[PDB]
Design a protein around this ligand. Structure first.
Ligand SMILES: CC(=O)N[C@@H]1[C@@H](O[C@@H]2O[C@@H](C)[C@@H](O)[C@@H](O)[C@@H]2O)[C@H](O[C@@H]2O[C@H](CO)[C@H](O)[C@H](O)[C@H]2O[C@@H]2O[C@@H](C)[C@@H](O)[C@@H](O)[C@@H]2O)[C@@H](CO)O[C@H]1O
Lengths: 310, 315
């Protein structure tokens, strides 16, 4: 009688990343990854429980809302601005809630590039927008405490006490001094303080298995690089699972990547209860798969199930 | 027949299908004089995408292509021509029965965003990696150089030189550059997709109330501005999550009009009712313009199929 588990019917070209507002470009593996994988956006259990900083809006991923309170010039170039942040729905962020940070807060170390825009509260309001960068590794990045900093090239035209939106676009840099690491969590309350209420880390537990990611290439403001952001599940999956809230019948679901044309299965994967995929693959890099393919739920299995090798 | 359904999403869990914005408020404007015929956020109740509608929230008002060259334009700023492909990177075939590449903007205005590039060619000394650049950009969709159905559009930058010819280019929309009279913002005026003096084709049809006392109901989002005075909004017929849901489900439509109730989960009560029409739009019995003041925690629930003779309870 339990509601059957399902995934949406969506090709890679119909999916978007749950960790940054980007389309999914390729499926991807990296077996030799030395880092602990514990991202906080795109986290949802198979029975529909959102975790980490995950919320449902594609427009909310790596977004901030708040007001500017302080202008501090950089030593050499640019200007820093303190921003008090609210929840994305505009209500005050309550730091006593059991979340790591306001929902949508970025979940990686780096310099995030985007646009800060403002519409004044006070017969038509005045507006302004400028390019902006948020350094999530900065000691001033303390979203769990209700405050962050962003920097601009613009030196003066940011207003205080006025509603402010950050729309993310890409990364500002991937140079050594910009500290881009997609698997390093920001310190949500500042450097000396432990992050709290985190979605759990994910890993394969069967020899020969590795994580399977939905990879998107992220725009760069300048420099050399081909940076990517890998998510455990696309945003449409998070949205689907939340809607469905189907009971999980074991800790591991078997899914098949199918070509609808031929009806052929290209490979199978384990979809784990906590909301991530593993496959039996001994290499790194993109999965080369037809454009019409998608994952279909097959059955519930267990941690001891042996995946057909890719 | 598979039962028709809507997703269970509060207003605060929905996004606009015509620009990448959250839904802020439900909205009516009974005395609107324009024909309402937007092309994004168009989907029948049985799951048929229409106009330039596609499924990705990242694809709405996005472009992908390659800059060809810097071009002269009499208007202020530095101007660049870019060819445009489909969003998936394949060549746009002007013989397909669509008005323009899916995701193309469906309104007249100066769309503000960011152009970014990642070069095709890589440098061995740079670890075999490509050079990149990004800058703010504006696309005037009313320009005679806005010809997405012909595979080319033009954008302007404040930046004067640092845009590279022949390199992969992405436009990420952010808001509008201006809503002054001279910036020709009109959310119900379609661009001329093939340029000045040409007829648009393959359009999703116009929408309108039929029953006396009814008006369209919109999902409204406020859109950021680069500068100037204004509080511009973009109104969609259905949010992007509804397009995505109807597409997935493709439930047969059992009449031309479905009855839906806007419900408060906490109270459990119906705040108002609306008609959800087969072509994918809502009407209500309301004789005022402005926001519908209700909890963002409320949502639409499918009640039953009705017909063109059914009278809505007044809001
Ligand atoms: C500092 C930062 O946040 N990112 C920098 C890049 O500098 C930023 O992006 C540039 C495109 C400019 O807008 C710059 O003002 C901005 O701070 C930096 O790019 C170079 O920046 C210098 C000036 O500092 C020049 O503008 C230079 O042209 C930029 O080079 C870019 O990348 C090249 C590889 C080429 O693709 C050029 O066409 C680009 O303009 C990069 C490289 O030093 O480093 C980031 O950290």
């Amino acid at each position: 009688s339990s509601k059957p588990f399902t995934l949406p019917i969506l090709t890679l070209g119909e999916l978007t990343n749950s960790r940054f507002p980007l389309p999914i470009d390729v499926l991807y593996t990296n077996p030799n990854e030395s880092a602990i994988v514990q991202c906080q956006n795109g986290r949802c259990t198979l029975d529909g429980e959102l975790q980490g900083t995950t919320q449902l809006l594609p427009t909310g991923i790596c977004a901030f809302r708040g007001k500017v309170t302080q202008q501090v010039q950089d030593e050499h170039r640019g200007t820093h601005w303190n921003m008090t942040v609210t929840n994305l729905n505009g209500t005050p962020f309550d730091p006593t809630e059991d979340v790591p940070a306001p929902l949508g807060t970025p979940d990686f170390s780096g310099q995030i590039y985007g646009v800060i825009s403002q519409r004044n509260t006070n017969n038509l309001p005045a507006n302004r927008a400028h390019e902006a960068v948020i350094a999530t590794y900065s000691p001033k990045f303390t979203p769990k405490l209700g405050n962050i900093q962003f920097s601009t090239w613009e030196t003066q035209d940011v207003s205080s006490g006025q509603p402010t939106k950050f729309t993310p676009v890409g990364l500002a840099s991937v140079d050594a001094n910009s500290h881009f690491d997609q698997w390093t969590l920001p310190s949500y309350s500042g450097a000396l303080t432990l992050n709290m209420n985190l979605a759990p880390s994910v890993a394969p537990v069967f020899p020969g298995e590795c994580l399977l990611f939905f990879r998107s290439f992220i725009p760069l403001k300048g420099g050399y690089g081909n940076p990517a952001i890998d998510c455990l599940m696309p945003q449409e999956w998070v949205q689907h699972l939340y809607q469905e809230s189907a009971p999980s019948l074991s800790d591991v679901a078997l899914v098949r990547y199918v070509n609808p044309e031929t009806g052929r299965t290209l490979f199978e994967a384990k979809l784990h209860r906590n909301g991530f995929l593993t496959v039996a693959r001994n290499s790194a890099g993109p999965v080369v798969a037809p454009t019409n393919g998608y994952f279909r739920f097959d059955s519930w299995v267990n941690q001891f199930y042996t995946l057909a090798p890719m």
